[PDB]
Amino acid sequence: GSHMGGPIKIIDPEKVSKEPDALLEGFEWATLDLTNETELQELWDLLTYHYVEDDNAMFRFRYSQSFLHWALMSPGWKKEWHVGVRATKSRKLVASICGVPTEINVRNQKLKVVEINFLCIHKKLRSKRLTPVLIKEITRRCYLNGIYQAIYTAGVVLPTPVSSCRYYHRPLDWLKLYEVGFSPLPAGSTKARQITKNHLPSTTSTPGLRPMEPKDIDTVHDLLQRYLSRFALNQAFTREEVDHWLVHKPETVKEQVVWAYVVEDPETHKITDFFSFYNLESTVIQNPKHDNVRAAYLYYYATETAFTNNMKALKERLLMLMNDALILAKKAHFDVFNALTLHDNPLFLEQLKFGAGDGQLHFYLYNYRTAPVPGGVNEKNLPDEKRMGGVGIVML
Ligand SMILES: CCCCCCCCCCCCCC(=O)CSCCNC(=O)CCNC(=O)[C@@H](O)C(C)(C)COP(=O)(O)OP(=O)(O)OC[C@H]1O[C@@H](n2cnc3c(N)ncnc32)[C@H](O)[C@@H]1OP(=O)(O)O
Ligand SMILES: Cc1c(COc2ccc(F)c(F)c2F)oc2cccc(OCCCNCc3cccnc3)c12
DSSP: OTTTTTSOOOOGGSSSOOOOOEEEEEEEEEEEEETTTHHHHHHHOOOOOHHHHHHTEEEEHHHHHHHHHHHHHHHTGGGGGGGEEEETTTTEEEEEEEEEEEEEEETTEEEEEEEEEEEEEEEGTTTTTHHHHHHHHHHHHHTTTTOOEEEEEEESSSSSSSSSEEEEEEESHHHHHHHSSSOOOOOTTTTTHHHHTTOSSSSSTTEEEEEGGGGHHHHHHHHHHHHHSSSEEEEEHHHHHHHHOOOOOOOTTTSSOEEEEEETTTTOOOOEEEEEEEEEEEEEESOEEEEEEEEEEEEEEGGGGGOOOOOOHHHHHHHHHHHHHHHHHHHTHHHHHHHSSSGGGGTTTTTTTTTEEEEEEEEEEEEBBOOOOOOBOOSSSBBOOOOOOOEEOOOO
């Protein structure tokens, strides 16, 4: 045993069944080959019309083939972790659950895990308890390949979250967000006044800031590992993951999904900071004027300033950098910039006019117990500088 936590069940891979369990009559297992446009496009269609985490929302995600490729074919990916269910007689894809491999540090300990997402069941098949069946089959496939833990997030509370982080939203085009009914008009205020309140300039302020290039990978990999190692729960990137997750490839990528910038110090020419964000659009269900909201999501970032252990200095450096990330998202035509209260986010959220959203994201670990980790928020569910150092991993 151990007073530090660790696995719940020890698994012998040689004792795991090599055949899957039987599904409901009329249905069969499928392994998706996402390198085939036809199957990619079946998955796109199931998610487009059935992946609605909250039917109460006024927006739905709108995927691109590029976002799907970026999200599901990361380094080490295996086709057998893209699991589907088909109707035998029509061949129609009606459920999915997918995993990709990586490594995370959970307090003292490094673990190989899969990140699980895109769990989705067609509306016609809801409430048949298919979920535990999907979960048990991708588990079996991971166990056979030597992976016995997983990490996932959900908007709903399930047994023992390791952490919870609150949604925050910085309007970039306030007038459009007011028109789609995302933002109300405050008491006593006018449109002109909210437009003025949320206005940003068109030029950045941090000297040396430019888009990340392939030749930066090694230095950003190293800055990012040292930066993330300040958090209890963090992702342990390899150099190939930095390449896949952070560096846009225009020859390869139809629609840019990820924006990464570095600051190359002008005096020294060393990279001292970087930040990145990704693009995921939302369709607006019922609106006379707009069809979509283009949302940027804050992803990974780092700064050398964090290692002077001067918190005040770190805060100022992030206010400057994150203000320029807002300016750059706004120039690339995003409507809203989303962030969570993880990493060192509580240092800048409020000051940069991010507003509290109505929603929380919970982190879970499968087959592993560890003490809970602070999610950047206090008792009142507001951001709190004393509640950081916990969650150093972002999920798509
Ligand atoms: C070693 C490797 C191990 C690998 C596996 C590790 C574990 C993975 C766990 C899954 C992780 C999902 C993460 C994401 O994809 C992000 S979260 C994105 C989640 N996707 C969607 O929201 C898509 C839109 N909605 C749907 O399709 C969804 O309706 C459904 C698939 C989420 C649920 O389908 P369903 O309504 O037909 O329910 P059911 O009859 O099949 O079974 C219900 C049981 O499932 C568990 N149930 C309901 N919602 C759940 C959820 N979000 N996560 C987990 N369990 C859930 C519940 O706790 C419940 O339990 P009980 O009744 O027994 O108490
Ligand atoms: C989700 C989400 C929201 C609420 O959504 C929007 C709010 C305002 C908008 F203008 C908008 F377009 C939103 F989508 O605000 C957030 C703030 C921070 C982080 C957020 O989500 C992080 C997790 C996103 N997972 C997206 C995903 C992943 C896999 C499959 N399909 C969708 C969110």
